[PDB]
Structure formats: C-alpha cells, structure tokens
C-alpha cells in the first residue's frame, strides 16, 4: 500500500512498452485498463485494478468482448471467458509476477492461435539508440526521408580526438550513411596548446560550414560527427521531435552547450 502504485504504474510503463497498440488503458494511470488478446485477436479483456492489486492479491476481470459471428459463438461467450480468464488470474494470484506476463501463458497454450514456436524481433535500425564507448552520441533526427545524426564526444588534445574519429570514420558502419562529415576542435582553456583543422570527407562545402558552427555554437575541447542516412517516408513521427529532446541532452552533456 506504499511504492505499488509505482510498481504498478511500472508494469503499465512496461506493458506500454512491450505492447502499447495492443493495450487500451480506461483508466489514467492503470485502476482499470482493457487489453486485447496478446497475439493480436479481437477479444479485449477488461480489467480492474483493487486496493488489493498484484501485491496484496491481483487484478479484478470485470468484463471481456469479443468480435465474432455466428461461427463460433456457440463455443465461448463474454461471461464464460471472464470465468477462466479469472482461473487464469489465480495462476497470477500468487507469483512474483504483477499478472500480465504469467496470465498470458495459460491464454497462449489454451486459446490456441499458435502459428509457429520462434520469437522474432527487430534489431535492425539505423538510428544509433546504444550508448559508445568515450563517445557521447544520441542526436538523430529526422527530415523527408533522410536521417540526419551526429556523435559528440569531448575530448583532450588532438591524438585521442584523432584517433576515436580516425576510426569512427574509417569505420564500415559509419559508411553505411551516404556521405558522413566531422568536426574537431582544441582549445585550451587557459593555456595555449591549440590544434585546428577542418575534416570533409563527403562534401567539403560542409566542412568549414560545420567548422564555423560549432565555433558560433560556443565549444571546443569536444568532437561532433554528423552523417546523412536514408529511411523510410519519415521514418516515424516519434523519432525526431521526440529524440530530439533526448538528443539535446546528449550534445549539451559531452560539452557542446557547456
């Protein structure tokens, strides 16, 4: 009766995640939620969240609905579904688990529906979303088809700067883009000690231009990679705006808003 709440509203966060089109919640922050079956069916689950939630017991099935025609009907109504569905919440009643992923179990072998027995995800994007090592790079936006990013990494005089980007750039993955440009800088800053040069790479007009940029932006001691990639229409409405925010932490944080 403490920190379930949080909990609770951890595994909303969590089924949100896992399955966000899938599950339609009534309520604001979980009380009483409606879920559709997890392959993707018809059936929606409705389902109520007690003072005596997962902790103390486990949800509340209140209703169930289903889209069907005369063609099995006759086989499984709303009311007779809620009756296993709640046996089902007894498996949940008393496990570790909140209810959603250990209820699901008994649902995936007794409902059926089992077309083949391999899991499938996707790894493949382009958008670099995994942190690197002495690099600091999460700024990927997104622009009519194409995909633009950049990688900021701060850093000391110019061999390591050097180095990091030697390999970065002279690496397959970052060749995956069409053309790729970088920056790098040194400014001491209260000695003297200042290396400056300008990369291009892929198109030289944007070199100095991304030279002069982060000079106007205010910041040195710190590299910024950028490369143009090829997605999609747009790839996806969440990923520049939202990213964005995301990406605006990660440049400001290596050292280019400092």
């Given at each position: ?52 939630y997962?902790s ?18 006759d ?52 958008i ?79 070199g ?44 400001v ?5 400092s």
């Amino acid at each position: 009766m403490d920190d379930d709440h949080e909990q609770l509203v951890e595994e909303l966060e969590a089924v949100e995640a896992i399955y966000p089109d899938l599950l339609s919640k009534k309520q604001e922050d979980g009380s009483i939620i409606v879920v559709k079956v997890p392959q993707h069916e018809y059936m929606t689950l409705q389902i109520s969240f007690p003072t005596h939630y997962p902790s103390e017991e486990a949800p509340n099935v209140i209703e169930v609905g289903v889209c069907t025609s005369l063609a099995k009907r006759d086989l499984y109504d709303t009311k007779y579904l809620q009756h296993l569905f709640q046996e089902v919440m007894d498996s949940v009643f008393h496990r570790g688990s909140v209810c959603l992923f250990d209820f699901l179990t008994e649902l995936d072998g007794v409902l059926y529906v089992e077309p083949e027995e391999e899991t499938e995800p996707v790894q493949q994007s382009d958008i670099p979303t995994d942190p690197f090592e002495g690099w600091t790079a999460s700024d990927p936006i997104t622009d009519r088809g194409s995909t633009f990013m950049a990688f900021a990494a701060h850093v000391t005089s110019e061999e390591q700067a050097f180095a990091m980007l030697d390999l970065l750039k002279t690496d397959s993955k970052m060749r995956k883009a069409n053309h790729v440009m970088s920056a790098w800088r040194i400014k001491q800053d209260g000695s003297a000690a200042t290396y400056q040069d300008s990369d291009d790479d892929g198109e030289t007009a944007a070199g100095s231009r991304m030279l002069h940029l982060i000079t106007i932006m205010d910041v040195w001691n710190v590299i910024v990679v950028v490369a143009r990639w090829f997605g999609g229409a747009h790839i996806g409405p969440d990923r520049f705006k939202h990213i964005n925010s995301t990406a605006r932490e990660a440049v400001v944080r290596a050292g280019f808003d400092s």
